[PDB]
Design a protein. Structure first.
Ligand SMILES: Nc1ncnc2c1ncn2[C@@H]1O[C@H](COP(=O)(O)OP(=O)(O)OP(=O)(O)O)[C@@H](O)[C@H]1O
Ligand SMILES: [Mg+2]
Length: 496
């Protein structure tokens, strides 16, 4: 065999999470492929939601302190909106992890700023890594995070970071339940262009996991109106919506509606890390004890491990919905669940094209979850096209800039300004008192007009979105400014 790192992680994790193992072949196959493998490996692990794919990351990480010929640490990338506190809290509790950590958990926009040599410091708080060069000595695992290609505002950048990563022959794993083949092709391209050892592992017809979940029946229904029309006390409930503001106002009423106020909970991303971890701890207590209602946004979807009897979610494109569906009957002796998609809900950040097409195709071909046969074709038809909006001459300059030591943040910033910028999505540190909260340039403006922000060390005192985009400019440059919250942070609602 020759993998006792893998089983070391499987035991230490299965202790902490209190489950008894099952062998999950694709995980083993993926671990071996990585540790074996002549060349730089480029794995696409295409496994259903709930398989246990985060194990591979844990395993590989407890394989970095023994063998370091291929990589010296693991960088685990979650999606942009995502909450990373849950994986951090089992890396810390289950395995005991500027310093060198075996397992670093980041978010996909942070990741690309880092590779663009931009200042991401207070995001990494000591600090786990702070340099492009540490990333180049890593194995980089995207955990459902490649879906930055479906964001118009980033695709050109995240593609340059895929191009550049592959150019430096960094080993790469791509974890996803929902792999389009438009996606598969641009990955395979860059993995072939740089002579990786490319490989796709999807489950095959005998998989002990798919059959565990074929036995389950989890009904999915469509509906309209207020999400609290559909709650069911006495079961584990979860309402997942597409914006934090939507989530907050549902929670403002759910606190009074739900029988036990103790068991109503709001999670989104506009909260402090301290707060997030507090909630993660309450949430793991809540799963073994009885019933509760959880209000959340997409932030809960790639990286948080919970399981809920009834789920009510907004309509969203198929990758997001599969993600969300995965959290309903997730563990093994849970065989019945219900899902309610709200076809009238607002799109939020999502493109309307893809959301509607998603809902048209599901309604034709009723899909059973965690069982790719049912959703694979929806995925490939929805999640296509990316090449349309790639500013491919900038994508070229970005890959030359990262490759060049002589070029730093100032040069990459004024490069993109020619071709205010992509800076729409450069989240900046709002400091609430000792903790912080990432917020978009635009909610920085909003919070400024309401006179809840004070900026030490910058003096144009924000109006005009372009003023905000300049705060983001200087934060990315490492300017000595502080963006401070003056209001009193709401310890259940997060930030406005
Ligand atoms: N070897 C294993 N055997 C049985 N169960 C496992 C194993 N590894 C992990 N799990 C289970 O899977 C759960 C974690 O799965 P996890 O959510 O990491 O899968 P995932 O592929 O990341 O799913 P998602 O796509 O929803 O993030 C744990 O609660 C644990 O019970
Ligand atoms: Mg995960």
């Amino acid at each position: 065999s020759h993998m006792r790192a893998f089983e070391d992680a499987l035991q230490k994790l299965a202790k902490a999470k209190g489950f008894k193992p099952e062998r999950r072949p694709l995980l083993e196959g993926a671990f071996h492929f990585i540790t074996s493998s002549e060349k730089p490996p480029f794995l696409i692990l295409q496994a259903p939601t709930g398989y246990g794919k985060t194990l591979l990351s844990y395993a590989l990480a407890v394989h970095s302190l023994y063998d370091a010929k291929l990589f010296d640490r693991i960088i685990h990338v979650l999606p942009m909106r995502s909450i990373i506190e849950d994986i951090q809290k089992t890396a810390e509790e289950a395995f005991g992890f500027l310093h060198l950590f075996p397992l670093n958990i980041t978010t996909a926009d942070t990741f690309t700023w880092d590779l663009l040599k931009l200042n991401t410091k207070r995001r990494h708080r000591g600090y786990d890594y702070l340099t492009q060069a540490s990333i180049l000595t890593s194995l980089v695992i995207f955990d459902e995070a490649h879906f930055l290609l479906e964001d118009k505002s980033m695709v050109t950048a995240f593609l340059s970071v895929i191009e550049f990563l592959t150019s430096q022959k960094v080993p790469i794993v791509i974890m996803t339940a929902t792999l389009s083949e438009a996606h598969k092709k641009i990955f395979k391209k860059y993995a072939n262009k740089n002579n990786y050892n490319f490989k796709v592992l999807d489950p095959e017809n005998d998989d002990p996991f798919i059959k565990r979940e074929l036995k389950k029946d989890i009904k999915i229904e469509f509906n309209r109106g207020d999400p609290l029309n559909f709650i069911e006390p006495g079961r584990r409930n979860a309402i997942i919506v597409n914006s934090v503001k939507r989530a907050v106002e549902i929670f403002d009423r759910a606190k009074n509606i739900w029988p036990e106020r103790d068991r109503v909970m709001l999670i989104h991303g506009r909260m402090t890390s301290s707060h997030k971890r507090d909630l993660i701890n309450c949430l793991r207590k809540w799963q073994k004890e009885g019933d509760f209602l959880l209000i959340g946004t997409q932030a809960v979807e790639a990286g948080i491990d919970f399981s809920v009897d009834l789920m009510i979610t907004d309509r969203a494109p198929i990758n997001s919905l599969i993600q969300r569906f995965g959290r309903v009957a997730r563990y093994k002796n849970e065989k019945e669940g219900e899902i309610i998609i709200l076809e009238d809900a607002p799109y939020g950040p999502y493109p309307e094209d893809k959301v509607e097409k998603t809902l048209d195709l599901m309604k034709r071909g009723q899909i059973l979850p965690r069982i790719p046969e049912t959703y694979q074709t929806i995925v490939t038809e929805v999640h296509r096209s990316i090449t349309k909006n790639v500013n491919r001459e900038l994508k070229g300059e970005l890959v030359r800039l990262m490759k060049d030591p002589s070029k730093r943040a100032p040069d990459v910033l004024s490069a993109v300004e020619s071709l205010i910028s992509i800076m729409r999505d450069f989240l900046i540190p709002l400091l609430v008192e000792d903790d912080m909260v990432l917020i978009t340039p635009r909610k920085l403006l909003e919070l400024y007009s309401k006179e809840l922000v004070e900026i030490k060390g910058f003096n144009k005192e924000i109006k005009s979105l372009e003023d905000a985009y300049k705060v983001a400019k200087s934060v990315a440059l490492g300017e000595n400014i502080e963006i401070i919250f003056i209001g009193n942070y709401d310890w259940e609602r997060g930030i406005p």
